[PDB]
Design a protein around this nucleic acid. Structure first.
Ligand SMILES: [Zn+2]
Length: 254
DNA sequence: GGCTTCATCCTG
DNA sequence: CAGGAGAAGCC
């Protein structure tokens, strides 16, 4: 679950409980139990995302921070229901008709307003690819900036200090769209390629966010090793890059 | 900045 | 059951 999936999840959390008084609040972690009585009768005002960090803002200026890493998942249920699962329940936010449940996540903390800028992840993350105010022109400037122009794309496109919300499938899909492998730096691209990359860094995550739940998003190379590339027909390969799986086409990525 | 450790779930 | 599937820890 990368930035598009976490924003889709947050949209669902809002549809379920934004604005509604909380009738029960439960946390598994001992250090969070103190907030349960404090939040009953308060409500979620908005569910903000910054990449894969999810920020559940409450009406008393507290914010729950949660990050699913590789395994956390939210579920929306009718109040009082809890489908059998063997996942460990970590958070429950309950209203009169809907409840939201966070399973399995281990990075969960309660933030004061000041911490929204000083928390170690929140302080480090870059601009979010799903932020509609972020433009291809600003992304181009960021690629060519002294800070990032000498960074290899293999790790750059996983680094949330560069652009928040990119993960491994988006890395693989964006590099294939622009015909590049991971072993390039922005300083070495021509202007056409830099512009293509800046656009793809925003447009592919936005297209996944808009249509993966639903022209619709599809993987061109992720998990398609052994299949022919739909652009050039070469057989897609699986290898490792940056200590993560990597999918690419040897016929049209260079 | 790139490699190894944490963390939970699911597979082969 | 050991190893695969996002970032926080050690230089
Ligand atoms: Zn190809």
């Amino acid at each position: 679950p990368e930035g598009p999936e976490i924003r889709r999840a947050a949209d669902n959390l809002e549809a379920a409980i934004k604005g509604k008084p909380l009738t029960d609040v439960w946390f598994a972690f001992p250090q969070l139990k103190t907030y349960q009585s404090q939040l009953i009768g308060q409500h979620v005002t908005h569910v903000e995302t910054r990449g894969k960090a999810l920020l559940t803002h409450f009406s008393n200026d507290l914010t729950l921070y949660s990050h699913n890493q590789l395994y956390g998942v939210w579920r929306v249920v009718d109040t009082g229901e809890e489908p059998q699962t063997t996942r460990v329940l970590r958070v429950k936010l309950q209203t009169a008709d809907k409840t939201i449940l966070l399973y399995s996540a281990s990075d969960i903390e309660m933030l004061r307003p000041e911490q929204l800028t000083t928390h170690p992840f929140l302080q480090r993350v870059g601009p979010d690819v799903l932020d509609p105010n972020l433009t291809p022109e600003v992304v181009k400037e960021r690629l060519l900036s002294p800070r990032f122009r000498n960074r290899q794309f293999a790790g750059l496109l996983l680094d949330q200090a560069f652009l928040a919300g990119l993960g491994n499938y988006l890395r693989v899909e964006i590099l294939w769209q622009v015909g590049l492998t991971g072993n390039h730096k922005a300083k070495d691209l021509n202007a056409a390629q830099l512009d293509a990359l800046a656009h793809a860094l925003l447009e592919i995550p936005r297209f996944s966010y808009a249509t993966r739940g639903q022209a619709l998003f599809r993987f061109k190379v992720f998990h398609r090793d052994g299949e022919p590339c739909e652009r050039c027909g070469s057989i897609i390969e699986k290898t490792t890059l940056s200590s993560r799986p990597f999918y690419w086409c040897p016929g049209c990525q260079h």
